[PDB]
Amino acid sequence: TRAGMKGKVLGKEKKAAIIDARKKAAESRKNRDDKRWKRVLANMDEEKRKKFHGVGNTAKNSRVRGATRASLLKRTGRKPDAVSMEATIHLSKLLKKKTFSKRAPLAIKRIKAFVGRLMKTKDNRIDASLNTYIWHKGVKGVPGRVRVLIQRKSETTEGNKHKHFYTVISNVPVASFKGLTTKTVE
Amino acid sequence: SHCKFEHPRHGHLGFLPRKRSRQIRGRARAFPKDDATQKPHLTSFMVFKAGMTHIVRDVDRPGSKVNKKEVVEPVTILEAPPMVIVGIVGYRQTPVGLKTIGTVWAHHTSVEFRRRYYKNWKQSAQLAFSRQKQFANTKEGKVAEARTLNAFAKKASVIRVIAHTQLRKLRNHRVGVKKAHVQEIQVNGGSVAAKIALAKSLLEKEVRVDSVFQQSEACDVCSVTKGHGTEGVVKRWGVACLPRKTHRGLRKVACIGAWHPARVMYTVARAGQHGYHHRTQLNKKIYQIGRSVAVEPNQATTTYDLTAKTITPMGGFVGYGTVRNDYVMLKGSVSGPRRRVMTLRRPMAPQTSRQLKEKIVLKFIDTSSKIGHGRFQTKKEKNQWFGPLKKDRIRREERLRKER
RNA sequence: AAGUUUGAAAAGCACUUUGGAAAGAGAGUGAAAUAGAACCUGAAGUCGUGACAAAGACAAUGGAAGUACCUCCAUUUCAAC
RNA sequence: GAUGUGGCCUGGAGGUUAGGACGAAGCUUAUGGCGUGAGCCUAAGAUGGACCGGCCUCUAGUGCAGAUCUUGGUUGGCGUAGCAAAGAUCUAACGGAGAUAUACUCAACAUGCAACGUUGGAUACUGGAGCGGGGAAGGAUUUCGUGCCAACGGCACUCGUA
RNA sequence: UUAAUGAGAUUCCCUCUGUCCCGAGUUACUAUCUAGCGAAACGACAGUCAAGGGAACGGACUUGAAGGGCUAAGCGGGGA
RNA sequence: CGACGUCGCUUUUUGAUCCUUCGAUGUCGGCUCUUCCUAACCUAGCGCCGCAGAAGACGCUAAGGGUUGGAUUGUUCACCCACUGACAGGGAACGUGAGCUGGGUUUAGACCGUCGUGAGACAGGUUGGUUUUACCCUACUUAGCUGGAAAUUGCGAGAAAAAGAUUAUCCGUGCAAAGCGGACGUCGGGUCGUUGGGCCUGGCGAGCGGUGGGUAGUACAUGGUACGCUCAUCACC
RNA sequence: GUGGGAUUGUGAAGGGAUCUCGCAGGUAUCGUGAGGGAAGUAUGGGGUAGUACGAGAGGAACUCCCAUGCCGUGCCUCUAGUUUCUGGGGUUUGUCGAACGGCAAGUGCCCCGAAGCCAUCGCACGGUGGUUCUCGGCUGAACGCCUCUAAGCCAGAAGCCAAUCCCAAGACCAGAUGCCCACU
RNA sequence: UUACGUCCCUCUCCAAACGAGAGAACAUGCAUGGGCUGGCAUGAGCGGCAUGCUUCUCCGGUGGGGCUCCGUCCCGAGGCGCUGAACCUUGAGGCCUGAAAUUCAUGCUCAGGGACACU
RNA sequence: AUCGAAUCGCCACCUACAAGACUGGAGCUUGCUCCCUCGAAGGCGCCAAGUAUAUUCAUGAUCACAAGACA
């Protein structure tokens, strides 16, 4: 990043102080606007209030007007090294109009990149069950959706500086994909 | 020897070079001629292309076969959220062209206006206009602003305002850009003192499109066309295709020049960039200046068709989304794809024609699905055709029995 | 097509260190390894590198006169010489 | 085109006079000097390692920029044209130096990539006029096992008709 | 002269069509970018034009007009 | 309009010549594509007529724009059918073959007529007869990076600027006027050089402000800014 | 002055000298517009009008209005085309024991088919002032009269120039602005 | 030669041969799901006078032929019902989390990394 | 801050304008006469801040880029 935000240059303690500086400055401005909107909405007449719909966060099925969705997310903390996730990959949307003879090999690379982005790993092992499922209808009959189980594990080659993570991706057979969302399994 | 038969040359040599436009936004190269007898007014506005549909109206022109008869006209819908005026600039005439005298900035500028000065705003220090804010409102700052304003009164013949779009108000998910589009809008009409008075009164204020244009007027469109990358001579210039027998290819120009001059002329069609060119388009009749759906929901309702509809077609505008702001319905088409910012300019050609003077009254606005042969104008019309479906029974049965 | 023409003598580089190896870095022999095995001498052409000179587009080169800067070049002078 | 030149240069011979291990020949040059010139001579080598200069005469396979000249080497084009018929490979494990290869910071991604052989699975091709199993002609050790990877198999190899 | 026969030469009709009006869209393999590998042809020197003369059709010459440098993909006007 | 004569222009015809090319400049026609000329067919104006009107003739300025679809023929030409405002004529190596095509022309096979004793010949007819190469330099079309006014240097100083103790020694207003209207103070120190001297700096205040705390209504398109009051802080200082 | 490097080839570690280079600009917007390009061009109908003119026969034009041809610049709402969304269905031969799911026939084949692309096969838009030619005139001499000219003027062509439109500062913009930094 | 900042890596697509461009920079940003819009045309399975379907008790329920032991079980293309069902719907990149109306949920991110700016 | 340089006329009186067939102003006689500021000077600057009572200049040795230059 830019020199003014580098973690190595600023240091851990300085970086934390600046991040809280932005947080408190933005959070305080949100509380000011919440109070003012709470105040002027009550003051305004019911005839005028029909025009102002959703302004004071009164509306249903609505985002929080004050702040971003991400800022309201609860940052629990670092995930454990050994974590298991179950997810669906919409393979058909990644293979639209691809060359027929490369569909199954391309699906393997797409799955490895999908998991690699999620788990931040470069060593992504494909289990036999997942490989069989991808190829079970031929090189060009790849299924539109796949349900995978992602398991991240830690093991480093002795004498290496940086700890080494790797994932094992296996197929999860499902009768239907409807209603299936991404879950952290145990 | 002379060519055996004559035909007009392919393409317009005045639109050269056929290169990529310097900017993605439409910019007016000239403004309509200033006439001092009119009250001061703005001459341009920035809009966003949402999509296309068609309307029905009666034709008023006498002597035509379609007089007092209905016609169907394709229209383009362009979203026009209000614009914010942030600055004033003055120009003085010199023997080598107009020179900017100075810039009077507003006391407060929006965050999305200051984002235009950054390549990575969220990770920056966000110090734009921080020293200008501290210098302004001081004893020396107030004097400097007054001196610049007096210089405009004494030496300026052209007064323009600095305006920017509001991407927060647009609330479009596919537009992507969060930094405002900045442009200069010339203040035409009145004396130079009167022009400065209006520009000062507009500082830090919102300007709506309906205060710049009227419903039945025409306007010019400055925009950049859709890009196609590298294209051959057949598509780029419209030359004929060679016979199937041709060796080494058909989609070519057979002779790219005579022996002498021993050169290829600039008038010969060659492959290269096609599209993404700036174009100023003339005489686009405004058919409707719509209000925001939060204020008036019945945008597509007319006096003849009483159905309560918005301007947004069933299923949304393809690749754009919902029109949530004020909008302009221009007759016909404009250059460029959806999501692209465009400039509407007050017309520069004479507007004395019967077609240009005609008062437009819309009788029907189509809101059917732009996805695959829309046959319903509203969601209620679709419900009446199908009635209850299997998924409606499941949703109702669970609510009727499990929840009650 | 091809001189095995290294060196007087093989004294043909033990040993240490990095490298999977090829090799590199050291250390040794020898008067000389820039004499290390198709090994005397080692040209031209072409190329790499460091230093410097600068230089628009007049293709470059060239001629004649100067000048700026350099010069491991030559010669002369250095007391009333 | 003719002729002249105590005019220049090269390999040898008969004479004469010199030089060289304190460095001959050859080679190198912003080494200068001499000559109108061909050239001659000196300086330096942080070059070389054993022969050789001047002068008189004699002698000849005696002087190169070009002959689509000969032979050897080099070279811009150029990391370019391309290496696109015969459909195709994927996965885990094992093997291998061929890796998970890191100053600081730093939990992992954003700093060791890409490539090999075998086995098990998967997928596909040949489709009996077969990339099946045997012979003639031709070839002659290419057969087999182990080892090995400098060159070669126009990419690669830990594999091989090397 | 001639039935039958003909990858023989010719004319017309039916059918049929992207041959054409008049082009548009899509696929595989390329081109294109990368890793590895890696040539040839050709090569006096070079390479912006106008006119002029000139071995009568110049990249060099005269007089004018251009011309900041280096690059990727194409292209077939010139390089007689 | 123009006999008998006479004076010219042009190089889109042929002829005359033999300067260039024979260690090679690819031959006709068509297709495609661009540009140029004007001796003007149509389109814009304008004169004149054996000019009533309509339709035309002749002429001038003007080449910006336009100038077609087909049957036969390899054709260029020619001719006919048809549309049109009109269907003008030409150049660009008889533009254009590393752009195409290859019907003709003009190799070798073969047939006919005429000629020749013959082999063979024929600007006579006929049929069949390989169309190669760009990755170089320019040109052109798009597409990137990039310095530079002494067009890389000199320090070689030129503003389509201001208007003054020589631009210093304040800000407005006015005509480069006459005038006129404004300006934060105070108490000390240090440090250099003719008048309440320049500069640096500290303490008390005040004012114009920038941010944040607490608060009230209002504006604007309505989440997000501004504005009143009041605290804290920073800056001019 | 200060900062950073280096010097000529037979050794090492230290000292001088002498050279070269850096020492104030970066980064992000909005504009100017020199120069270059340059585009719109034709026809028909209505009406004028069976009018002007003419013995008759015949038979016009401008203002204005409405269409259209060619050309140009775009666009995808509609209509049409295109399908490797092999989307959803059918359907033939082979094949996994059958059903299911499918698979092979280099996209098996057939019908329909979104999005995207695309057609004068669809749709939209295509403008203003001057300077002059040719020519017709005014005033008016030379030449007491006369004469468009000779000194002056007027009017004036699809030509030409500029506006509009496209590229645009090697056209080196002392054009205007946002932030740092440098100087102060 | 400090700061502002720029670029590469990463993500998006109005751009795009490669460069370049437009953007984003913990952001409903991305992912999956739901709903919408639309495409095709009624999935698998099971079953016929009920044990099924439909409707608030009332409706509805085949088949040319054939085989066993009038009646009963069975074989049988096709038909009917559950079923405008099943499947697909953003991907080179349709909509909805900001009008009102089941019309939107849930996961993921945990100091962004690198290089210049900087003789 | 390298940096030593080439350049040798200043101004707040020129730094406004226009016409040479007539631009100092009149007359009538229209090319002569008359009046005036008499129609041919931007102002300063060149060694006593002003025309005089004065005052340091060397040896920088006879030319050498003025050895110095904020007028």
Ligand SMILES: C#CCOc1ccc(C[C@H]2NC[C@H](O)[C@H]2OC(C)=O)cc1
């Ligand atoms: C038959 C016949 C007549 O037509 C031609 C056609 C071409 C040629 C060739 C010559 N043209 C110029 C040069 O002299 C030669 O070029 C070359 C490549 O040889 C001669 C006659």
Ligand SMILES: [K+]
């Ligand atoms: K002599």
Ligand SMILES: [K+]
């Ligand atoms: K050779």
Ligand SMILES: [K+]
């Ligand atoms: K020849």
Ligand SMILES: [K+]
């Ligand atoms: K005419």
Ligand SMILES: [K+]
């Ligand atoms: K013949």
Ligand SMILES: [K+]
């Ligand atoms: K111009």
Ligand SMILES: [K+]
């Ligand atoms: K022009």
Ligand SMILES: [K+]
């Ligand atoms: K510039």
Ligand SMILES: [Mg+2]
């Ligand atoms: Mg012609």
Ligand SMILES: [Mg+2]
């Ligand atoms: Mg032609």
Ligand SMILES: [Mg+2]
């Ligand atoms: Mg021709």
Ligand SMILES: [Mg+2]
């Ligand atoms: Mg061919």
Ligand SMILES: [Mg+2]
């Ligand atoms: Mg061929």
Ligand SMILES: [Mg+2]
């Ligand atoms: Mg659609």
Ligand SMILES: [Mg+2]
């Ligand atoms: Mg020794």
